[PDB]
């Protein structure tokens, strides 16, 4: 099983290639990591395994979900430390994902009810609804287009949050630049309609993710920085006319950051849509090797994500399409997913109803082990 | 095994509940049924089993795949007859699926290179491809929105083809009203942007499928007509803002057609969604497998008659669906491609041949068509 052959991720020696994908679960009451998060990550931690945390706030304006953790206050860093300590006691490596939702927020989630910030003034369309603090779903409001001068202020929030993460004991950080959130709102030409130096051409649209990665790379070192992109995922109206060229342009910038710093990033993390069920239709399979194309052009560690199974993950590693395989949904309901992939044992099903609830046990830590 | 308890599908008494799902295979060279189809359907026919044919053209404008069979010419009728006879010789029941692709076509498939017809002028998005006659995967073009008289012309094509089907010996026909093809392009508010009496509200959007079903029911009788739909589907941009209400509106129409005709349709056939949610919140999308099951059972409980489910089913999922009352029959597609004796394999709980997607749509009369081995 090539999923359990050791792999050196920069300076971290991993014993296997099964990775916990970042997953918002909304158990961090009041934006403060709670003891429940420790038991949740401790359950899934393994000796020499790689874990990525749920998206974590970098500032008071970056949230678009209820009760998601932040890492922009020393109070939050102190709570994260207790969680990271428990995870390191099991021998796992843990990165914290730095998450800013941009226009994918609501006044109820913003201080003083301010409008969310984004690259554009265009709101997410009515085809998408935001989970509200009362369990209902509401409308995405019109965001405020941040001025050219303000982009460096947001970059500074990433930089400070990476430093707070190191202060909490995290091994590294992952930049959340996928799924139509703030960074993807600058990448995709279906959203970025800016006239300034951050909009228009492909090179300009990659300016934002570049300065963000450069800022955290300089602060804590490249080998502690991972980057997650989703060029071909249309979530929250975040479509690009040419996902291939966008992906390659990002890879080009990432290779350049590594060449300038003289160090390789922790990894590149690319996620794709799950077309598992398109085989039962007449035309679902007619006609995109983007994953392999980006893997071929990138210099360093590649984590593939999106609809991967035990058999698909094995094939991906044995084929060389990726070095590590991250699992989301399966990890929600299978705390010992690593061992289950080892033994090829049956997997538990997940319950969508408790993805985003606040119970510290129900649907969170009560999925059974083998 | 509840799958092998008999079932009375109207006037047809079936011996088991394993159904051959309709599957385009592209072996009907020049749109004429070929001897290969006879051997293909013969291999899968069982005594008292139900078969549904590949989607079959109702008119020269109805195709969006290469070498798909027609049933709108008398030559096609004569060739189908030979195939139905071999199936009937094995004691099987066989329906012919009537299929119009509408905007899911290309100029290379249309008479005189004309534009495909549809409810709208909007083309299928760049996320989808069409199979071209040379095996390449191409881009769907802009269709032509058709008017009221032309719509009635299409209904007449369905009606004439229904009559040809029974003249060829078929036990009945299935209306293909799923997967974003012509009927679904009228049903789904994600496709139908019309402002006339065929677009807008749910009532207007269900007008076309209602007229098609009524025409064929009046022509050959209700108990020889089945209807297939897919209210929650990504295929070919066939999204709807409220798949549940759309599905119930259709069921209401079918129930009323049955009451007015004093007879019941052969069945309602509903396909599972071709997608699985990932925690997202998109209008018109089912958020979980549990909501998916509730959708299907709600349509089943609403329809006055036989219910066939399809889409990713296995032996275990098919037993459960029948045991739990979720469906009366279960149709299998890909597993039937690679397992000509799938019925016996389900019965014996035997291993199943893998299928080769390569050869689903090639034109070879044997390779990947009739060369899958028996037990
Ligand atoms: C409930 C839930 C929460 C998620 N939260 C995040 C997140 O905070 N950050 C992120 O980058 N991806 C997030 N994801 C996406 C996962 O990483 C996703 O499941 C993965 O990209 C696809 O892998 P899978 O097929 O194994 O589920 C989330 C997914 C789910 C279902
Ligand atoms: C190759 C192929 C061709 C198909 N052709 C048709 C068709 O012509 N008409 C139709 O209504 N469905 C068609 N379908 C959908 C199937 O009838 C059925 O809904 C699907 O195969 C069920 O899923 P399963 O293969 O997992 O059993 C086709 C499916 C496949 C895979």
Residue numbers in the entry:
A (entry chain B): 10 to 296, 302 to 384
B (entry chain A): 10 to 384
Structure paper excerpt:
Jasmonates are phytohormones that are pivotal in mediating plant responses to various biotic and abiotic stresses and regulating plant growth. The first crystal structure of OPR3 from tomato (SlOPR3) showed that the enzyme crystallized as a self-inhibitory dimer in which the L6 loop, a critical loop involved in substrate recognition and coenzyme binding, from each protomer intrudes into the active site cavity of the other protomer.
The self-inhibitory dimer of variant R283D differs from that of the wild type, as only loop L6 of one protomer intrudes into the active site of the other protomer, while the other loop only covers the active site entrance of the other protomer. The folded hairpin-like structure of L6 that only covers the active site of the other protomer is stabilized by an intramolecular salt bridge network between E291, which usually lies above the flavin cofactor of the adjacent protomer, R294, and D243. Unfortunately, it is unclear from the structure how the amino acid substitution induces this semi-self-inhibitory dimer because D283 is not directly involved in stabilizing the folded L6 conformation. A comparison of the protomers in the R283D dimer shows that in protomer B, D283 forms a salt bridge with R343, like in the R283E dimer, whereas in protomer A, D283 is not involved in any interaction and thus free to move. D283 is located only 3.5 Å away from D243 and thus might push D243 toward R294 via electrostatic repulsion, indirectly supporting the salt bridge network that stabilizes the folded L6 conformation. Nevertheless, our crystallographic data show that substituting R283 for an oppositely charged residue generally affects L6 conformation and thus the dimerization process.
